[PDB]
Symmetry: C3
Subunit: 366 residues, 3 copies
């Protein structure tokens, strides 16, 4: 039976720490420098406590429902508190305990994306209720559908590190929320930590320290750089000069955009995706006419990256190639469907979360 | 003869960097945001210079006296400046040079815990003298007794990553010291860096990227989260609302509490230890009626974690199981003895350090 | 044919992230706390955008020209956008894609060293032109000459991690530039991030998680500590007391000094190099009578470290030993020649870069 490779174990445990670093303190500092000074402490507390919450719900039943075998939409409850998972159990080429952790850290950053932006306007108890409802009914099923052998994966959707599961999912939850900068060095510091942590996020998604991890690593460097330049150029063009926030936004734009594509594309596709994503991101926030503008970058770039993954995975364009019997035509259709499903699923669940919270403790911070 | 495993080498070198990160700048920023603004620069200088000092004393004779073979209390001086340690020498499944580094980084964070808190009130030269005396007569012997085949290990004490060697040892040295917040975003940033670095501290204590490292990794995530929630709950209960400092303290509480237990317990035990530690930590600082309050968390949670390791390592409770012929009765007795010995040994040595310093250069900062 | 070792792949990918961390946000925060408050945002933007630029030029033709086979001074253009590099291509004991990334990250920090210091006084477009010219005509050829089988390597120059390619190269470019602290906690934070990232920089230069990486790791810890103490001592001696900036400068001094020597020397040589470098660094900045003073540390310590590598690599002094038939006499001569060549090559190219920029868009910020 399958034996764990210590090199992959090492890599994946370090990658998980890097993803945890994206939340604690990555996203917290990113939002901290953007929101009003008088709201920072509170937001920092909300991100820390909800992070703890997600970690616990993950171990208690999150992992089992997301990654256990079940149906197209959710797993099972046979892994409650990781029961039935032998310590030496192997998943892929690493111990399953590591997969649990790595996957849990993706749940954390996703929630951090939402809470950091909404902390200012939402009541503490309301956010806890929302987190519980949305992690359970949206994050878990979508993670199951994309990486848990569910509906989307079973139809061949390409999403290496979560353009759907993380970015689009959270962008929509945050935008439903919105519908209902004092420290730029701080924003930069959080952007930097997100960037560095993102190497575990993207490369670690290979599940092994192989050539695919190497590819995702290089593409991340390339798409992020291309997006910083694309954004900055659009900014110099529209506003006459680049800005620090523009540069950070650009980096996030490329990072988000390359997320679903990193392990399937060539460096050439990474450069193109990065440029398009930096520009689309700028167009995005511009059109979005607020820290919630952030969901404009995550949502627009997540959609763009997911669609472009269906183009650039082509052998012809330097990608690793589409699956057997799959054309670019067919693949693009599947990407569009995965995006639509994600937008609607997250939107509805988010609307139910906020509404439930509003009905139980009241949303609007007292 | 024993051959080094490159995966373990990679893992352990990365884990050492993560532990170094806990001090530089982890603990420095944690204390930096807590102490008075006018004292920050000085404290930062004291932590940096004493960190350099510990690194040098470690290589010169620290490692040899802690990890060389000798007696129940200390090693030998056959590894002065690492002489007699062939470059290719293997310790466990990694090169010995890596073990030297990894172990040295534990000495560093321990000292950083003490210096960051006392920098404000202690004279520079006095702290250097104290560091020399206490690292040499307390840290080294206790490290030798617990992880160097000394008295405590030879009696079967369980302490995976240093609830005694690091936490209790330093909590007591700091409290003897005490007997003789302006920037909360900064406190949060240091807490976050401590958390992330703590993965190398805890997981790296397996000495290999195996299932025990995976277990320690997951338990760290779980106990920290459980402690953040336990603390926050106690805070909402006693003070009417959670606070940022409460959330950070909770995280430190769970981290400290799970330190001796991480590699021996189940995730269920990790959750219970985390909750108890977050609450005990809150009770601790509360009773301690000052940045020195920090020693209340490290000391109380270190004791709690060490005792609970003697309960939760039981197979019955999801642990890896006690050693052959050892009962929970017998094990708890050994944990209590290791704690008592650590409290007294560190207390006496710390008292001698401060007193010597006071007699030579005067303690009270001029 | 050569097969990739996943442990080395893991290690090298994590080491690359650590080197990227040195720039984003390491050096940016180091300079951020040193320069005038009103110039921080701009400098941060310049470092971010030029970082993106270097990443792109690297992939487009940088890597190919630096590491492809060509002549003594530069490589070739057969690896444009990494064409002809099969995804599974192995370089040493890791996938070539990882070598590309790791090497690109060295290009980044080198440029960050220069831009962070000069951002204040240089026009944005002027710095972009300068970066393009200097990366292309100085960084690339020197990287090729030292690590790309060029002139210096082919004559046996010892420079494990870049005392010439990075430190001296950038110190000179910055000093030619100069010829034409408001937040010390911030300076400390950047110093700390540089330190931690430096473990990937130095250890990762072994290209594998072996005993040489272990040696470089330990030596880095030792030389940095020795330099912090040497600097601080010189400061207490000359100025009556240590300072936070002194402590950070000392750390950078030891880090720089041990860079070319880390993989060839014994810990004893690391301690001596560290002390000499901390003192030489202090003497340096002192003599330099400004954030550009930083080039005094990088340049003086880079020269010192490079020369001392020719002494301490000797078996007699605990080093790994000089190559067959090479004496310390002969080796020191080669070190001096590599330093001279680097100083002049970088100086001339830098002078041409600034001048071209000045002639095209004007240097002096409007």
């Amino acid at each position: 039976p399958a034996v764990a490779d210590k090199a992959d174990n090492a890599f994946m445990m370090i990658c998980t720490a890097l993803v945890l670093f994206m939340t604690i303190p990555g996203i917290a500092l990113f939002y901290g420098g953007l929101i009003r000074g008088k709201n920072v402490l509170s937001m920092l507390t909300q991100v820390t406590v909800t992070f703890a919450l997600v970690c616990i719900l993950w171990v208690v039943y999150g992992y089992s429902l997301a990654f256990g075998e079940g149906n197209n939409f959710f797993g099972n409850i046979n892994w409650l508190m990781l029961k039935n998972i032998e310590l030496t159990a192997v998943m892929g080429s690493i111990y399953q305990y590591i997969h649990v952790a790595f996957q849990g850290s993706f749940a954390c950053i996703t929630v951090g994306l939402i809470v950091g932006a909404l902390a200012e306007r939402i009541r503490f108890s309301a956010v806890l209720i929302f987190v519980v409802v949305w992690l359970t009914l949206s994050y878990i099923p979508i993670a199951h559908m994309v990486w848990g052998g569910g509906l989307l994966a079973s139809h061949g959707a390409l999403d290496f590190a979560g353009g759907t599961v993380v970015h689009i999912n959270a962008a929509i939850a945050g935008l439903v929320g919105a519908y209902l900068p004092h420290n730029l060095p701080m924003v930069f510091t959080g952007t930097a930590i997100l960037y560095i942590g993102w190497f575990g996020f993207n490369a670690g998604s290979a599940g092994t320290a192989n050539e695919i991890a190497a590819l995702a690593f290089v593409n991340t460097v390339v798409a992020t750089a291309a997006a910083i330049l694309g954004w900055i150029f659009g900014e110099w063009a529209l506003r006459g000069k680049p800005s620090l926030l523009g540069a950070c936004s650009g980096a996030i734009a490329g990072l988000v955009g390359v997320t679903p594509a990193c392990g399937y594309i060539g460096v050439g596709g990474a450069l193109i995706i990065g440029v398009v994503a930096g520009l689309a991101g700028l167009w995005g926030v511009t059109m979005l006419k607020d820290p919630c503008d952030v969901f404009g970058v995550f949502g627009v770039c997540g959609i763009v990256g997911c669609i472009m993954t269906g183009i650039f995975a082509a052998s012809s364009l330097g990608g690793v190639g589409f699956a057997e019997g799959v054309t670019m035509g067919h693949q693009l259709l599947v990407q569009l469907e995965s995006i639509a499903i994600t937008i609607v699923w997250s939107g509805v669940v988010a609307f139910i979360g906020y509404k439930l919270a509003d009905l139980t403790v009241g949303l609007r911070v007292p």
